[PDB]
Structure formats: C-alpha cells, structure tokens
Design an enzyme around this catalytic site. Structure first.
Site, PDB file in Angstrom:
ATOM      1  N   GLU A  65      -2.530  64.634   7.096  1.00  0.00           N
ATOM      2  CA  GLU A  65      -2.027  64.117   8.117  1.00  0.00           C
ATOM      3  C   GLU A  65      -2.932  63.435   9.147  1.00  0.00           C
ATOM      4  O   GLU A  65      -2.276  62.265   9.615  1.00  0.00           O
ATOM      5  CB  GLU A  65      -1.531  65.457   9.130  1.00  0.00           C
ATOM      6  CG  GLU A  65      -0.378  66.239   8.496  1.00  0.00           C
ATOM      7  CD  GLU A  65      -0.278  67.680   8.720  1.00  0.00           C
ATOM      8  OE1 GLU A  65      -0.709  68.288   9.811  1.00  0.00           O
ATOM      9  OE2 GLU A  65       0.653  68.445   8.114  1.00  0.00           O
ATOM     10  N   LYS A  77       5.310  76.998   6.567  1.00  0.00           N
ATOM     11  CA  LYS A  77       3.981  76.480   6.360  1.00  0.00           C
ATOM     12  C   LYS A  77       2.669  77.236   6.334  1.00  0.00           C
ATOM     13  O   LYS A  77       1.709  76.929   5.901  1.00  0.00           O
ATOM     14  CB  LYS A  77       3.930  74.986   7.132  1.00  0.00           C
ATOM     15  CG  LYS A  77       2.875  74.188   6.842  1.00  0.00           C
ATOM     16  CD  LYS A  77       3.070  73.019   7.915  1.00  0.00           C
ATOM     17  CE  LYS A  77       1.743  71.932   7.644  1.00  0.00           C
ATOM     18  NZ  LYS A  77       2.037  70.889   8.544  1.00  0.00           N
ATOM     19  N   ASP A  99       6.926  64.008   7.590  1.00  0.00           N
ATOM     20  CA  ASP A  99       5.862  64.545   8.190  1.00  0.00           C
ATOM     21  C   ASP A  99       6.498  66.015   8.228  1.00  0.00           C
ATOM     22  O   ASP A  99       7.545  66.604   9.201  1.00  0.00           O
ATOM     23  CB  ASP A  99       5.630  64.380   9.783  1.00  0.00           C
ATOM     24  CG  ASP A  99       4.435  65.454  10.406  1.00  0.00           C
ATOM     25  OD1 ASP A  99       3.836  66.048   9.710  1.00  0.00           O
ATOM     26  OD2 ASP A  99       4.274  65.115  11.517  1.00  0.00           O
ATOM     27  N   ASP A 128      -4.908  66.497  17.311  1.00  0.00           N
ATOM     28  CA  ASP A 128      -3.546  66.978  17.017  1.00  0.00           C
ATOM     29  C   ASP A 128      -3.292  68.272  17.625  1.00  0.00           C
ATOM     30  O   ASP A 128      -3.823  69.041  17.202  1.00  0.00           O
ATOM     31  CB  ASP A 128      -3.670  66.961  15.616  1.00  0.00           C
ATOM     32  CG  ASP A 128      -1.907  67.367  14.964  1.00  0.00           C
ATOM     33  OD1 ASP A 128      -1.233  67.461  15.865  1.00  0.00           O
ATOM     34  OD2 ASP A 128      -1.796  67.310  13.758  1.00  0.00           O
TER      35      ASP A 128
HETATM   36  N1  ANP Z   1       7.728  65.463  26.011  1.00  0.00           N
HETATM   37  C1  ANP Z   1       6.909  66.563  25.421  1.00  0.00           C
HETATM   38  N2  ANP Z   1       6.255  67.178  26.621  1.00  0.00           N
HETATM   39  C2  ANP Z   1       5.658  68.382  26.164  1.00  0.00           C
HETATM   40  N3  ANP Z   1       5.640  68.948  24.845  1.00  0.00           N
HETATM   41  C3  ANP Z   1       6.370  68.529  23.930  1.00  0.00           C
HETATM   42  C4  ANP Z   1       7.182  67.251  24.177  1.00  0.00           C
HETATM   43  N4  ANP Z   1       7.736  66.915  23.321  1.00  0.00           N
HETATM   44  C5  ANP Z   1       7.674  67.958  22.140  1.00  0.00           C
HETATM   45  N5  ANP Z   1       6.592  68.941  22.679  1.00  0.00           N
HETATM   46  C6  ANP Z   1       6.373  69.923  22.256  1.00  0.00           C
HETATM   47  O1  ANP Z   1       5.694  69.764  20.938  1.00  0.00           O
HETATM   48  C7  ANP Z   1       5.684  70.724  19.950  1.00  0.00           C
HETATM   49  C8  ANP Z   1       6.188  70.457  18.555  1.00  0.00           C
HETATM   50  O2  ANP Z   1       5.101  69.098  18.262  1.00  0.00           O
HETATM   51  P1  ANP Z   1       5.278  68.732  16.964  1.00  0.00           P
HETATM   52  O3  ANP Z   1       3.958  67.582  16.781  1.00  0.00           O
HETATM   53  O4  ANP Z   1       6.638  68.041  16.656  1.00  0.00           O
HETATM   54  O5  ANP Z   1       5.264  69.766  16.111  1.00  0.00           O
HETATM   55  P2  ANP Z   1       4.266  70.031  14.356  1.00  0.00           P
HETATM   56  O6  ANP Z   1       4.520  68.741  13.679  1.00  0.00           O
HETATM   57  O7  ANP Z   1       5.202  71.186  13.758  1.00  0.00           O
HETATM   58  N6  ANP Z   1       3.026  70.362  14.618  1.00  0.00           N
HETATM   59  P3  ANP Z   1       2.457  72.092  14.220  1.00  0.00           P
HETATM   60  O8  ANP Z   1       3.097  73.055  14.808  1.00  0.00           O
HETATM   61  O9  ANP Z   1       0.906  72.148  15.136  1.00  0.00           O
HETATM   62  O10 ANP Z   1       1.839  72.130  12.553  1.00  0.00           O
HETATM   63  C9  ANP Z   1       6.351  71.854  20.502  1.00  0.00           C
HETATM   64  O11 ANP Z   1       5.837  72.927  21.355  1.00  0.00           O
HETATM   65  C10 ANP Z   1       7.318  71.243  21.667  1.00  0.00           C
HETATM   66  O12 ANP Z   1       7.973  71.782  22.742  1.00  0.00           O
HETATM   67 MG    MG Z   2       4.376  66.959  12.758  1.00  0.00          MG
HETATM   68 MG    MG Z   3      -1.896  71.563  12.014  1.00  0.00          MG
END
Ligand code: ANP
Ligand code: MG
Ligand code: MG
Ligand code: CL
Length: 378
Positions: free
Chosen positions: A172, A68, A7, A196
């Site tokens: 996704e 991205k 991912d 999401d």
């Molecule tokens: N336990 C948690 N509680 C709250 N927020 C969290 C927790 N774990 C991770 N995060 C938050 O989740 C976010 C990252 O989510 P994640 O799905 O891993 O990112 P991503 O895959 O890059 N999605 P996107 O940025 O929308 O393309 C960050 O803002 C983190 O601070």
């Molecule tokens: Mg992700």
């Molecule tokens: Mg997205």
C-alpha cells in the site's frame, strides 16, 4: 482491455482504472467512490458492499467484516484469538485455519477469509465492469507492507477466485507513492513518509526511492486505531446526551447503539467540510426520535488525545530510519481519516509547516497508484 487497481482495505475498498492517459476512480451503484468491505448472508441472498453494511444492525451474526484481519493467518495466531473476542460473527477452526461460520439460505455454512475477500473483490470487479462496459480480467491488488508470504498468497487467491489474473501484489505505501509520481526521480535518494489513517488501522511508512527502486526504511503505527475509534467517541458523547434529555441509558441496547454509530460516522464525515452537523435518527430507542447537532470543535475535543497519538509513531519511524524531520522530501496522506482537518493540522505542524500531498482523495490514493502500476505492467 484495461487492467484495474484495487485497494482491498480492512473497512472499505476502492477500484481505479488508468485509460486515456489518466486515472479514474470508479463510483459504485450508489455513487460512492469507496465500498464497505462487508459481506452479508441471508435466507435468500448474498449481499456485498453498501447493501451488506446497510443491514448490519439487522443481521449481526451473519454479516462478516474485518476479513483482512484473518486472511492468511492460523486459527491459533494470537492476533486471531484476540480479535475474535470482539466480533459478532462466529469464527471456527478448520485445520488450524480460521473460517467464518454463518447461516446462509437456511443452512450453516463456513467460509475461509480469502473467500469472504473474494466476494468483496467480485463486487469491485463488477463496479469496474459497469463503468468500462466489458469484463475485466487483470488487476493489481494492494496489501500492507507487513503482510507475510501467507497473507500475500491468500490475498492473491481471493483475486483469482474473483476471476482476476493478479498481475502483482504490491505494498500500500508503494502504491500511494506511485500515485504522486514519486518513483520517477532518477539517480538520487528521495525520502517519503506515508501517513495512513484508515477505518481500522494506522500505518506510518518511510520509504527511500532511488532510481525507481523502493526501500522501506521504517514502519510504525497501531493496528487498532482508526476512524471507527473516532465514531466510538461520538457514540459515547451522544449516549451521555440522551441520558440528559431522556433519563435513559441506551448503551445495553445493541440495535440503538449500532444505528447511533452509523449516524455518527455520517456526521463525522460532514464535519470534514462543514463546521456543524445534524443527527436525525427516527425511533432510536423505545420509539424515541433523536435529533441533535455537533460542532467540529466539539468533535475535535472528544478525539483530541487520539488525534495527537498519531504523532508518536511518526517520531518513532523517524528515529528508526535515522532521519530528521527536514530530511523527508514528501508527506503523503492516505486513508479516509486523514480528511479530518485537525489531523492535517497536527501532521503539518509537526513537520514545521511542510506541504501535505492530499490532492488525491486520501481514501483513494492507494487504488490510484495500483491502477497506474497495473497499466505499466500491462
Ligand atoms: N471526509 C471524511 N472525513 C472523515 N472521515 C472520513 C471521511 N471519509 C471517510 N472517512 C472515514 O475513513 C475511514 C475509511 O477509510 P479508508 O481508507 O477508506 O479505509 P481502509 O482502506 O479500509 N483502511 P484500514 O481500515 O486502516 O485498513 C472510515 O472511518 C470513514 O468513516
Ligand atoms: Mg484503502
Ligand atoms: Mg493498514
Ligand atoms: Cl455497487
């Protein structure tokens, strides 16, 4: 030799592998099950992942993130023109393609977004090889459902540059449905909602799955709403508190704000499983230490309007799919921000008490499903 699922997220990336009848999500060298989508260039090194994000406050012009948002786009794309106003690194035009220009090893260098993402993918590949004990050469990589052919091509290019044979580029929300086994149904339509909420973006997808075939019925969301915005509400709260306890406005000090932001992101995560969190920053602003605390209830108040705003794209997606709330068979949580208890309550209440699929860590569910599909393809 097992193929991996990756991912590749805007803010974090995650890698999993299916072997011995189950998925394992692979922790990195620091023990973290996801890795920041960050690359940093210094006088002597290229840093990727945790090491790059950890020095962002020290090296903002040469630490690249959000690739991205650029990948596969033209420089004159209105999205590129708008996003570049807010990044601390320089974006340049090279044949109507954007490149990120940095200092690296004492020279000026520029990289395509797919080259930045190839470095993130190389780190994810290395994380997997450390766990498996042998090189990985095949992978499935995920993209947003809205990505066009050029964005998909550039993501595949990033993987090949990283040394992977890309078995497939998959959406996704499809990967998240596969993680929960929702595509095994047989004859019969099943309506699935993927909610999401990540670090930078919010996406709602309604899928109809019929005999293992996926159809996107509707999509909605906000490309600039995510966990980073919740962090920012905490930052502004503590900026006001520091004014009270110290008579000083730290908001024009870039160093202090970035370090406060890092501490707020950590406290936010703690509040997902505890009712209180402590902030302990040595030498925040002018050598002054900042020690304080915040309750989960106060955090929910600071973000209440942002949390509630996620329900309007759900309503819109349902209208576009011509479906009622009760016709949705499964609700799947994706993205690290869906670990916030208040967000789960809002979605469950909106669906009148329906179950939430959240037994896989939401920030890992896309990679989980990508790893399953990679094994199926192999
Ligand atoms: N336990 C948690 N509680 C709250 N927020 C969290 C927790 N774990 C991770 N995060 C938050 O989740 C976010 C990252 O989510 P994640 O799905 O891993 O990112 P991503 O895959 O890059 N999605 P996107 O940025 O929308 O393309 C960050 O803002 C983190 O601070
Ligand atoms: Mg992700
Ligand atoms: Mg997205
Ligand atoms: Cl690592």
């Amino acid at each position: 030799a097992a193929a991996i699922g990756i991912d590749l997220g805007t803010t974090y990336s995650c890698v999993g592998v299916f072997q011995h009848g189950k998925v394992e999500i692979i922790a990195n060298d620091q023990g973290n099950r996801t890795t920041p989508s960050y690359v940093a260039f210094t006088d002597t090194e290229r840093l990727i992942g945790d090491a790059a994000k950890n020095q962002v406050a020290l090296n903002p012009q040469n630490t690249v993130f959000d690739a991205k948002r650029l990948i596969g786009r033209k420089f004159g794309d209105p999205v590129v023109q708008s996003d570049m106003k807010h990044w601390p690194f320089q974006v340049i035009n090279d044949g109507d393609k954007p490149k990120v220009q940095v200092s690296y090893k004492g020279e000026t260098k520029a990289f395509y977004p797919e080259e930045i993402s190839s470095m993130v993918l190389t780190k994810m590949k290395e994380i997997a090889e450390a766990y498996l004990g042998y090189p990985v050469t095949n992978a499935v990589i995920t993209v947003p459902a809205a990505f066009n052919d050029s964005q998909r091509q550039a993501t595949k290019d990033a993987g090949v540059i990283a040394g992977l044979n890309v078995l497939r580029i998959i959406n996704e929300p499809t990967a998240a449905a596969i993680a929960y086994g929702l595509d095994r149904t047989g004859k019969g339509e099943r309506n699935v909602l993927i909610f999401d909420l990540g670090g930078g973006t919010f996406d709602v997808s309604i899928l109809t799955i019929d005999d293992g075939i996926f159809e996107v019925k509707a999509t909605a969301g906000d490309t600039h709403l995510g966990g980073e915005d919740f962090d920012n509400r905490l930052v502004n709260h503590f900026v006001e508190e520091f004014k009270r306890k110290h008579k000083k406005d730290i908001s024009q000090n870039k160093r202090a704000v970035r370090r406060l932001r890092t501490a707020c992101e950590r406290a936010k995560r703690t509040l997902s499983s505890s009712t209180q969190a402590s902030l302990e920053i040595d030498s925040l602003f002018e050598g002054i230490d900042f020690y304080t605390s915040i309750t989960r209830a106060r955090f929910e108040e600071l973000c209440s309007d942002l949390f509630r705003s996620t329900l309007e794209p759900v309503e819109k997606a349902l209208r576009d799919a011509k479906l009622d709330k009760a016709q949705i068979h499964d609700l799947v949580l994706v993205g690290g921000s869906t670990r916030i208890p208040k967000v789960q309550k809002l979605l469950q209440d909106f669906f009148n008490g329906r179950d939430l699929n959240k037994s896989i860590n939401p920030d890992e569910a896309v990679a989980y499903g990508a790893a399953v599909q990679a094994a199926i393809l192999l």
